[PDB]
Amino acid sequence: HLLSLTRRAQKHRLRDLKNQVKTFAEKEEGGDVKSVCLTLFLLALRAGNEHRQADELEAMMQGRGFGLHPAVCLAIRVNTFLSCSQYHKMYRTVKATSGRQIFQPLHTLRNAEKELLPGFHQFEWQPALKNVSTSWDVGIIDGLSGWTVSVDDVPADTISRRFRYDVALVSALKDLEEDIMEGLRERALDDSMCTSGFTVVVKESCDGMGDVSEKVPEKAVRFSFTIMSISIRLEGEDDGITIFQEQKPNSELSCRPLCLMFVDESDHETLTAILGPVVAERKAMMESRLIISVGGLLRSFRFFFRGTGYDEKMVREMEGLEASGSTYICTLCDSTRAEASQNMVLHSITRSHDENLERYEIWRKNPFSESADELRDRVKGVSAKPFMETQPTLDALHCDIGNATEFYKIFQDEIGEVYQKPNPSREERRRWRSTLDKQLRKKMKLKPVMRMNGNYARRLMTREAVEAVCELVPSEERREALLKLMDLYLQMKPVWRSTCPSRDCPDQLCQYSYNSQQFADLLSSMFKYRYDGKITNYLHKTLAHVPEIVERDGSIGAWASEGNESGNKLFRRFRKMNARQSKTFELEDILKHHWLYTSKYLQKFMEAHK
Amino acid sequence: HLLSLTRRAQKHRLRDLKNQVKTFAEKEEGGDVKSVCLTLFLLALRAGNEHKQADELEAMMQGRGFGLHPAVCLAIRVNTFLSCSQYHKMYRTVKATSGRQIFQPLHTLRNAEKELLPGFHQFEWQPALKNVSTSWDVGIIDGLSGWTVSVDDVPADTISRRFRYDVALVSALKDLEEDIMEGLRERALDDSMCTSGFTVVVKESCDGMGDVSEKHGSGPAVPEKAVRFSFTIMSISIRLEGEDDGITIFQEQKPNSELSCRPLCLMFVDESDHETLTAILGPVVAERKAMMESRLIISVGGLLRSFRFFFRGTGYDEKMVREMEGLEASGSTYICTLCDSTRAEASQNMVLHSITRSHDENLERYEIWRKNPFSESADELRDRVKGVSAKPFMETQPTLDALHCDIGNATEFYKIFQDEIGEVYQKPNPSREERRRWRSTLDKQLRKKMKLKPVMRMNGNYARRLMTREAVEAVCELVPSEERREALLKLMDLYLQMKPVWRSTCPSRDCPDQLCQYSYNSQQFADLLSSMFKYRYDGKITNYLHKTLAHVPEIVERDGSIGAWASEGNESGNKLFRRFRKMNARQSKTFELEDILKHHWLYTSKYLQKFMEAH
Ligand SMILES: [Ca+2]
Ligand SMILES: [Ca+2]
Ligand SMILES: [Ca+2]
Ligand SMILES: [Zn+2]
Ligand SMILES: [Zn+2]
Numbered sequence A: 001h002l003l004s005l006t007r008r009a010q011k012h013r014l015r016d017l018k019n020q021v022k023t024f025a026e027k028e029e030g031g032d033v034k035s036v037c038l039t040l041f042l043l044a045l046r047a048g049n050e051h052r053q054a055d056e057l058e059a060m061m062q063g064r065g066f067g068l069h070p071a072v073c074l075a076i077r078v079n080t081f082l083s084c085s086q087y088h089k090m091y092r093t094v095k096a097t098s099g100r101q102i103f104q105p106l107h108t109l110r111n112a113e114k115e116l117l118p119g120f121h122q123f124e125w126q127p128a129l130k131n132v133s134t135s136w137d138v139g140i141i142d143g144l145s146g147w148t149v150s151v152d153d154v155p156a157d158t159i160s161r162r163f164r165y166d167v168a169l170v171s172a173l174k175d176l177e178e179d180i181m182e183g184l185r186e187r188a189l190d191d192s193m194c195t196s197g198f199t200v201v202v203k204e205s206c207d208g209m210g211d212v213s214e215k216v217p218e219k220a221v222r223f224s225f226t227i228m229s230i231s232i233r234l235e236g237e238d239d240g241i242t243i244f245q246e247q248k249p250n251s252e253l254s255c256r257p258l259c260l261m262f263v264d265e266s267d268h269e270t271l272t273a274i275l276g277p278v279v280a281e282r283k284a285m286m287e288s289r290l291i292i293s294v295g296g297l298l299r300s301f302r303f304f305f306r307g308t309g310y311d312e313k314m315v316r317e318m319e320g321l322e323a324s325g326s327t328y329i330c331t332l333c334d335s336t337r338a339e340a341s342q343n344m345v346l347h348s349i350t351r352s353h354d355e356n357l358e359r360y361e362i363w364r365k366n367p368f369s370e371s372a373d374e375l376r377d378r379v380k381g382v383s384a385k386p387f388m389e390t391q392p393t394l395d396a397l398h399c400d401i402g403n404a405t406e407f408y409k410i411f412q413d414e415i416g417e418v419y420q421k422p423n424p425s426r427e428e429r430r431r432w433r434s435t436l437d438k439q440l441r442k443k444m445k446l447k448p449v450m451r452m453n454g455n456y457a458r459r460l461m462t463r464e465a466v467e468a469v470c471e472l473v474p475s476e477e478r479r480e481a482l483l484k485l486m487d488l489y490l491q492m493k494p495v496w497r498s499t500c501p502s503r504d505c506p507d508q509l510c511q512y513s514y515n516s517q518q519f520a521d522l523l524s525s526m527f528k529y530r531y532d533g534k535i536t537n538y539l540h541k542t543l544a545h546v547p548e549i550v551e552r553d554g555s556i557g558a559w560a561s562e563g564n565e566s567g568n569k570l571f572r573r574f575r576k577m578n579a580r581q582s583k584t585f586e587l588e589d590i591l592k593h594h595w596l597y598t599s600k601y602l603q604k605f606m607e608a609h610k
Numbered sequence B: 001h002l003l004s005l006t007r008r009a010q011k012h013r014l015r016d017l018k019n020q021v022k023t024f025a026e027k028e029e030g031g032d033v034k035s036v037c038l039t040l041f042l043l044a045l046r047a048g049n050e051h052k053q054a055d056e057l058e059a060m061m062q063g064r065g066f067g068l069h070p071a072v073c074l075a076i077r078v079n080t081f082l083s084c085s086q087y088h089k090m091y092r093t094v095k096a097t098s099g100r101q102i103f104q105p106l107h108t109l110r111n112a113e114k115e116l117l118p119g120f121h122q123f124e125w126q127p128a129l130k131n132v133s134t135s136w137d138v139g140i141i142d143g144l145s146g147w148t149v150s151v152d153d154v155p156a157d158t159i160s161r162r163f164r165y166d167v168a169l170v171s172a173l174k175d176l177e178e179d180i181m182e183g184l185r186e187r188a189l190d191d192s193m194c195t196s197g198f199t200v201v202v203k204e205s206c207d208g209m210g211d212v213s214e215k216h217g218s219g220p221a222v223p224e225k226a227v228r229f230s231f232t233i234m235s236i237s238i239r240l241e242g243e244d245d246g247i248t249i250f251q252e253q254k255p256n257s258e259l260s261c262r263p264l265c266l267m268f269v270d271e272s273d274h275e276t277l278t279a280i281l282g283p284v285v286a287e288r289k290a291m292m293e294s295r296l297i298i299s300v301g302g303l304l305r306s307f308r309f310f311f312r313g314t315g316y317d318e319k320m321v322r323e324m325e326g327l328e329a330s331g332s333t334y335i336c337t338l339c340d341s342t343r344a345e346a347s348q349n350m351v352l353h354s355i356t357r358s359h360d361e362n363l364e365r366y367e368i369w370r371k372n373p374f375s376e377s378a379d380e381l382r383d384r385v386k387g388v389s390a391k392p393f394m395e396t397q398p399t400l401d402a403l404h405c406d407i408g409n410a411t412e413f414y415k416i417f418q419d420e421i422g423e424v425y426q427k428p429n430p431s432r433e434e435r436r437r438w439r440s441t442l443d444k445q446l447r448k449k450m451k452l453k454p455v456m457r458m459n460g461n462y463a464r465r466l467m468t469r470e471a472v473e474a475v476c477e478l479v480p481s482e483e484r485r486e487a488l489l490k491l492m493d494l495y496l497q498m499k500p501v502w503r504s505t506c507p508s509r510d511c512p513d514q515l516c517q518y519s520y521n522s523q524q525f526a527d528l529l530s531s532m533f534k535y536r537y538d539g540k541i542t543n544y545l546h547k548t549l550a551h552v553p554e555i556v557e558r559d560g561s562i563g564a565w566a567s568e569g570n571e572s573g574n575k576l577f578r579r580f581r582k583m584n585a586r587q588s589k590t591f592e593l594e595d596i597l598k599h600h601w602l603y604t605s606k607y608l609q610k611f612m613e614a615h
Helices: A007-028 A034-046 A051-060 A070-078 A084-096 A165-186 A268-285 A312-319 A353-365 A372-378 A397-415 A426-442 A454-459 A463-470 A476-492 A506-510 A512-527 A537-544 A546-552 A562-567 A569-577 A583-598 A600-607 B007-029 B033-048 B051-059 B070-078 B084-097 B106-113 B165-186 B274-289 B318-323 B343-348 B359-371 B378-385 B407-421 B432-449 B460-466 B469-475 B482-503 B512-516 B518-532 B543-550 B552-558 B568-584 B589-603 B606-610
Strands: A123-126 A160-162 A198-209 A220-232 A241-245 A256-261 A289-294 A297-309 B124-126 B160-162 B198-209 B226-238 B262-267 B295-300 B303-311
Touching: A007 A034, A007 B007, A007 B033, A034 A051, A034 B007, A034 B033, A051 B051, A070 A583, A070 A600, A070 B084, A084 B070, A160 A268, A160 A583, A165 A198, A165 A220, A165 A241, A165 A256, A165 A268, A165 A289, A165 A600, A198 A312, A198 A562, A220 A268, A220 A562, A256 A268, A256 A583, A268 A297, A397 A426, A397 A454, A397 A476, A397 A537, A426 A463, A463 A476, A476 A512, A506 A512, A512 A537, A512 A546, A537 A546, A562 A569, A569 A583, A600 B084, B007 B033, B033 B051, B070 B106, B070 B589, B070 B606, B084 B106, B160 B274, B160 B589, B165 B226, B165 B262, B165 B274, B165 B295, B165 B606, B198 B568, B226 B274, B226 B568, B262 B274, B262 B589, B359 B378, B407 B432, B407 B460, B407 B482, B407 B543, B432 B469, B469 B482, B482 B512, B482 B518, B482 B552, B512 B518, B518 B543, B518 B552, B568 B589
Parallel strands: A198 A297, B198 B303
Antiparallel strands: A123 A289, A160 A256, A198 A220, A220 A241, A220 A256, A289 A297, B124 B295, B160 B262, B198 B226, B226 B262, B295 B303
16 A cells, blocks of 8 residues: 555655646646645545545644634633633643643733733723722722721621722723724724714613522622613714614623622612712713723713613612502502503603602602602602612513513413402412413423523413413303413514514504504403402503603613523522632622623634634 | 635636546556545655654644544543533634634544443453343443332332443453553563463442532432442452462552542442342342352453452441441440450450451351350350341451541540549549549640640541650650650650551551561550550450551451552542532433443543643
8 A cells, every 4th residue: 555655665656646746736836736735635635524634734734823822712711610720730631632732821811811801901081080089000899998897887797899880891892992993994984083972872780699508698789781882973963873783782791790799689778888889980970071092092982871670679679669569660650550450551751860859859858748648649659769870661571571470370360260250269279270280281391480480481472372271261252362362462572572673573563552552452351350450560561661662762672681680690600610719709709700701802702703 | 826716616727637646546556546645745745844744744644633632532521520511612612713623522522432431342251150141231220220119119219320340340451451461561471371360359448428418409309328339450460370379460559549449339328228228239249249250251452361350348437347247336345347356355465366257257157146056145145146146248358447547546645645644543533623624734735835726526637746756755744753754655656666557558568677576566565555554444445456456467468558458549539429410410310320420430540540641
């Protein structure tokens, strides 16, 4: 065979085809025999489906990399939840095997992120920022903000960490620097001038995490935000031009954490005491403008803030309402509970921050000297002083969740007879639930849970799930009734689920008024037995308040809180794997790893040409 | 330029030279395009004196670590707890990162793996095994052993996983094939003449982990107890052909590190009940019995070779040691696992004891006890049977625990100091007050001079830091009679000459000096003891002291070591277990142990640790 022989006998045997390739290459390629036999080797290896050896060959012939850049290394290090011990061991090992040192040694990451973490890119503002120190190079800071440790006084008992909000934002923007310049180039706009009038709208959000087995209670609260839109109004005479709208704000892959507090959602004192910094600097932000070094030039930025991502309970407890099922229910309309049953559609949005402060002041002073309940009424029941701003809108997920649980219960009830038997008893409810679970399991292959997450909800909204259910309905009238109800629901739901209804499906949106009206009509007429005076919140939102906000603020579901809560399982796992561990640090390093896992840059390096 | 053109257009452009090379291979080389173009590209690279790229090109066929040797990658996965999802992720990551295939994808790595688990190599056994399925290709079996699930009878819920013991063997042996062959190469022993006379020595151990913690188990899913029965190949020598009773072809270099301790079976049942434990281990024990006589035939290194084994059952702790010997528990008159003496006769004399205990004679004593062929009364019969009360079931030569091996000695020297600050043979019976007093003054003394806090229980390191001539001569300051000071000082010094004799791996090559003096040294020790502290050992003697002053020479003669048979190893390996359950359970106890065992067995292969060079 040719492969076991020496080069003397090999070249002696092959000299005919060697000079054949020689003359043919001097004929076609002009003095390039090496690339000719390279293309011959590539074709002979690809014809046999051994693409792997051809790829190794092409990675040898001027191959991109023997060893990797420290950046993508840090990416792999975090984006798979590996320990530092783990990475070092793997590193030594692989460096032994054929190793031209491939990964980077652990040491080099610890000063390779100084380019990605907060507190590294100089900047300033005009005017100078009020009540917020003009020192920038700092990074992570303990979350107490100098709580005078005196024992007898109010205790110093909370463990928390956070950033300077502004440093977080500038990290985020200087991070997106690449994409913003690329988009400016894509919009074909000039790049040197018109570099002083960008408007970046970015949503904040905050929700908790209860009962964590701690290594002060078990619960915890995480506070994050995500950049949504970056647009330009320059040079003027126009409203603006969107430079970069985020494509997938729902996925936690864009949910950058900004503070963490080992406390509970209810301890209003402790929560505000830690949050004062955050609120105050958010306040000072919206005034001035921001100068960074970006695109090679000193560029300017303004800001607006959309506070969306909160479950209801939080919104109430932070807007100073009465959570959660009391007389006042609509976080937007001043309607009482019961009147939202006879009428369900026309409800103007009124609730707003400034007037809520006004109403609280009216409560405190009581200039009219009214008695208790008229005082509740004239102020429309705003007793607690709100402290944090809110944008007036609802989460996208928990609408789905509440609708799911309500349909679940309405099925459990329509299994039996409640308009034939007005007040059923508890055991009948348990049995109807049991036969409902049997129906949902025998068909559709669905198992019960304690509480319904998003996936169980999405499963419980298929029309065929309602078909399998309604088989047990005795009255075929009521059967078709809930079928038409479900149909209306399916036609109307993807409106708020949509990321952009003005681009997804404007048809249901334009047909949403009449669809909602017909929905409320069927619900009342065939089901007043149950919604005489008691109605639920998200239902009220979706049958009374969807069209207003969908008209005004571009899109809902776009501002899903889904991201923060959904992603919070990252806070679950990080605590396990990469802990320090000691709660003095546990936060600090968790937050570090989190934000690291959050920036675009390493996600980009994770994609690596699809 | 030809380097930038697409492959469809470059095929259309070089199709004519493609037909030229095709007909050249058809006429001269038999129609092979690949070898032709490979040697062509080699001789074109070597024309530019570019030797490095040419040698990479040539080795890339059948060498160079193609992107990396897939076996190495499976290892580096296991050796770091790295989970499948992770692996795939970072794999795509690095491949799409830099233009190459560095690691191998899963499916192929795992197909390659299937050559390392049990149940992959043929073998034979001459003569055939006794009542053992002739099949050879099976793998991870269920340890219930076909338990008829009928509700009425004792339930069959106990979940277990294990191996056909023989197959686990043939796996571990086919692993250490490489080492036995290289060792035959160093010893220069012939090969067509070393095919038969082989003997492998097998160590074993079995302990259980308490109430293991796990995640997402707020209610009981019996995720608490686990008893991991395991073994580890100890040595291999030769027996062909003349006298040559043994040439140690391979002796393990460190039998304690769990890196070398292979698992055999895992059972979600506490060591408590005899029921389930015998229920599962029965198959294993019967197999071990049927594996002593007949000879195992292995296709190793290209040769069909014969193998016999010797079996030692060691790595058990005192509790289960009794529980598989049929003795009572625990600290009754019968105290020594080897010298069947009681406390009082061990207090009269302390070193004249012959190892008489053996599994067979204990079986015999059990028959004696059950029949009572003399109709003797209860207690008198238990005396005449000497500790054997329950039918033992598991042959196992016990040995002194190399782990504690000191703790009774430590508490004894502690009591010595506490009673020497007192004048205990001047006031023969003190109550609790002077007891706590002497304790406190002694502990303040130790903290003053050697800087050690007092403790409630004696671990290892406290004992080590306590058996220091420094602590002894420093606490001598408190005892008034210098006669007794020299007494306890000679005590400590003899103890310090004699403890490394057993603590070490093998004195026959480490320190034979104290070994050849050991019987005499221990005799002087017992003399000093029953001379100056006979007030203290009238008839009350603790266990560890009998064991240490008892038989160490007899053991190291019958065996050749102590630390080379301890169960310390398994106590480390439990850590492994935990972590694996933490990071590789499949979330179903029906599948859990199967997965855990698979990964662990991978983690304990001499093959894969050998791929852990770490230079
Ligand atoms: Ca939530
Ligand atoms: Ca134990
Ligand atoms: Ca144990
Ligand atoms: Zn309303
Ligand atoms: Zn003896």
